[PDB]
């Protein structure tokens, strides 16, 4: 299997906070650490393919966003991780392969990739966490 | 006194220009150097606290935005400074403590922190200036 | 000729893709490489001068955006050569990274960015052109 980068990069930002939470500036996604229970939604990643009627749509995470089997958001401190599962809201079939999440069937898919906490992680340190995904296509 | 970071970070960007001012791309805050008179408004910082009914809301400036006693926006050259005062528009009571601006009373405050020029600085070199504040809470 | 920086910096981003193009996150400008024919529009750059009734409006490109203007890949090798021209067809001049207006006045308008020479072999990637507002004097 091989990923060909071809499309834009979307960067999911999450701010983890304590119960008392102070939003400063533009609205962005924040969650308290008590909200980080297994399967809790973090946020959506919008996806739209064009010209892929005969290709398999895929997303590849940055190198520091996957440590095999698993995807995770990385802290700005380059240390703390928030493990997540990613899943299309339409329940179509996709596969995870070494940092690549690709759709099992060809077609110019459009949808939402939901990001959810993978295992309870209510001890996640407050800070700013990111997951970077780049669009492209997969082959075989 | 101790600040607990718990919330998002808002970055105020200011572009200082000459009289002939050429805005390129999307709207951002720009002011001519002649406009940097004592008390001149630079811009607002929106703040919204949640789950802090029993805590004191606070903002902490980045290390390079305060040189005790005083807050300032820092140039991208990391040299030039524009000193400012920050004050809530509702005139509520806050205290400054070594880079932290905290509310005197507990409660989930929402409001606007205005940034104002602290002393005439019409000789400010044209450039891009920033002040970064992070939401959290204080104690005592 | 001298450029005085005085105004904001606008950054034009272009994502070059293959035919099968996968957009992730919020809308941004993307073009397949087959779209990069000579004169193909890349995107506009809005410009608005104030207080320059007696000055010549100008834009200065970042050092890594002119040799000829070009967008530079995020990897820092690949270049997409372009020409910039105001949509209103007003008269401007290029001087070593500076694009300045031939007459004084607080011009407002759109600086169009167009492909300069066929470049359909442009590697996929993220390309940027950074322009800073200010004014020109001889």
Numbering used by the authors:
A (entry chain B), B (entry chain A): 0 to 139
C (entry chain C): 0 to 66, 69 to 139
Question: How did the manuscript describe this experimental structure?
Answer:
A unique CLS cocrystal in space group C2 was obtained at a small-molecule concentration of 10 mM and could not be reproduced. Ordering of the whole ligand in the P3 forms is helped by crystal contacts from a neighbouring protein molecule (Gln47 and Leu49) to the ligand atoms C7 and C8 (in the phenyl ring) and one of the O atoms on the nitro moiety (the atom labelled O9B); this crystal contact is missing in the C2 form and the ‘head group’ of CLS adopted a number of conformations that were not traceable. This raises the possibility that the nitrobenzene group is not required for DAF inhibition.
Dr adhesins are expressed on the surface of uropathogenic and diffusely adherent strains of Escherichia coli. In this study, previous structural work is built upon by reporting the X-ray structures of DraE bound to two chloramphenicol derivatives: chloramphenicol succinate (CLS) and bromamphenicol (BRM).
